[PDB]
Design an enzyme around this catalytic site. Structure first.
Site, PDB file in Angstrom:
ATOM      1  CB  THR A  11      -0.915   0.039   1.238  1.00  0.00           C
ATOM      2  OG1 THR A  11      -1.908   1.047   1.103  1.00  0.00           O
ATOM      3  CG2 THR A  11      -0.111   0.311   2.513  1.00  0.00           C
ATOM      4  CB  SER A  80      -3.987  -0.881   2.290  1.00  0.00           C
ATOM      5  OG  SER A  80      -4.085  -1.053   3.684  1.00  0.00           O
ATOM      6  CB  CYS A  81      -4.286   2.144  -1.098  1.00  0.00           C
ATOM      7  SG  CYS A  81      -5.014   2.992   0.374  1.00  0.00           S
ATOM      8  CG  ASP A 208      -8.249  -3.967   8.662  1.00  0.00           C
ATOM      9  OD1 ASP A 208      -8.140  -2.803   9.049  1.00  0.00           O
ATOM     10  OD2 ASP A 208      -7.791  -4.364   7.586  1.00  0.00           O
ATOM     11  CG  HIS A 236      -4.633  -2.859   7.686  1.00  0.00           C
ATOM     12  ND1 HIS A 236      -5.636  -3.061   6.769  1.00  0.00           N
ATOM     13  CD2 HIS A 236      -3.780  -1.969   7.128  1.00  0.00           C
ATOM     14  CE1 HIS A 236      -5.390  -2.343   5.690  1.00  0.00           C
ATOM     15  NE2 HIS A 236      -4.264  -1.677   5.879  1.00  0.00           N
ATOM     16  CE  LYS A 237       0.347  -2.484   6.717  1.00  0.00           C
ATOM     17  NZ  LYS A 237       0.190  -2.131   5.275  1.00  0.00           N
TER      18      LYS A 237
END
Lengths: 258, 258
Positions: A11, A80-81, A208, A236-237
């Protein structure tokens, strides 16, 4: 079922380093792995201010795929992004992408603007805490919003359950990044012929703390992926907190599509 | 228990990231820790070709020390080639350095050329395996030898006993670097008044596969440190393979000098 070539896309603000635990894990299962730095990310020599779009930010991936010999296919994995990166890549190079994997990721669609999933992320998670914002002007005069991610945000929301050492690594190599949101908003929609046509696997966890459950379930609803793998726990990771589980999921992605 | 301010200096090609496990360990014991990227290292924005000496390469450390308020003292901790950085720093800022710690490091002396320990390192370890060399020309026309460290060398000699993940991290964020050997050779000797005068603690292991036992014992003989701490086992990157042991040694350095 063929051993695959995974291409790992971090990300924004981050870099290939985010994948340090997952790469050897996949390699242990006989797979080939490339983990690229996107522009102005990781140890890429460029600065964010000389990058003008999300498409530019994706050049290293695009240059990688361009050079890939005919008939070989990769599985792109995005955190993510980086869902955006996949979408961008698949529109250019559909015939080289066996599948796209979304890892607590933005899942862009074909029906709305490219910025749509970003408007939604920010709607669901408006307060980025101690994150600082700056701006610069890109080569066609759009005002770009860049971010330096807050250390508390890193600790509590992104690397929530990671080792102190992983969190320390992050602070040591985190760099400014940007969503190029206003430029996405003016971009052509992602195509059905390319991005639309690739298999899509969505990996996530409800633990997350930045890509929240409501948002992630909304994403699944708005553009149904071909497979959803929900991972219990972690954060999240996942590629740090659930490395071995993710490696195993990617095995299944390889068996299915590679 | 004394609390100190440790400043952690990585070797060439590497970056502050090398210290990701050791920083939180020291912080757990109540210490303050700064881990700086030297020029063109880690995520420092500069490229190696715009750096002209080892003194320039040390600017971040020198600037750090310049900004440090009066009466505050640090313990500088240096790995591999960073012994040079310590020597350079102590000649400038002796009154702010409580002690210098050498971690499988070059131990420069006051009697010979600054390049002396480097000539010897290379004498003892002449074959850097799959390491590739490039050159560029510095601001005064000196031809500078830079290296991209070989992945086999990383695996077998530098990160011999580290996790696959740590080795993967290294390959993801390793950058070109240089010893600036010919420029060191022409540099003034390190002073007795500054570098000479600082306490020196030498930490090492005989399991190190690049800074070999004969060389390290030779260094101790040639310029006796105030304290030598031999660590059993591990490898060249003790701060990864013997993090907790090193933290403990540094406690003792703090209690003695801070």
């Amino acid at each position: 079922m063929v051993t695959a070539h995974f291409v790992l896309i971090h990300t924004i603000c981050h870099g290939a380093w985010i994948w340090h635990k997952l790469k050897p894990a996949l390699e242990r299962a006989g797979h080939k792995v490339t983990a690229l730095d996107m522009a102005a990310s990781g140890i890429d020599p460029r600065q964010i201010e000389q990058i003008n779009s999300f498409d530019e930010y994706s050049e290293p991936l695009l240059t990688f795929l361009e050079k890939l010999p005919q008939g070989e296919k990769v599985i792109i994995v995005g955190e993510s992004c980086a869902g955006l990166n996949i979408a961008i890549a698949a529109d250019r190079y559909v015939d080289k992408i066996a599948a796209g994997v979304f890892h607590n990721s933005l899942l862009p669609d074909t029906v709305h603007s490219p910025s749509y999933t970003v408007e939604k992320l920010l709607e669901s998670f408006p307060d980025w805490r101690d994150t600082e914002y700056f701006t610069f002007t890109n080569i066609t005069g759009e005002t770009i919003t860049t971010m330096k991610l807050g250390f508390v945000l890193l600790r509590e929301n992104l690397f929530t359950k990671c080792t102190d050492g992983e969190y320390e690594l992050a602070k040591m190599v985190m760099r400014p990044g940007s969503l190029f949101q206003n430029v996405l908003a003016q971009r052509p929609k992602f195509t059905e012929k390319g991005y639309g046509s690739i298999p899509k696997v969505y990996i996530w966890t409800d633990q997350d703390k930045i890509f929240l459950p409501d948002f992630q379930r909304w994403q699944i609803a708005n553009y149904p992926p071909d497979k959803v793998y929900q991972v219990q726990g972690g954060d999240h990771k996942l590629q740090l907190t659930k490395t071995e589980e993710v490696a195993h999921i990617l095995q299944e992605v390889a068996d299915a599509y590679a």
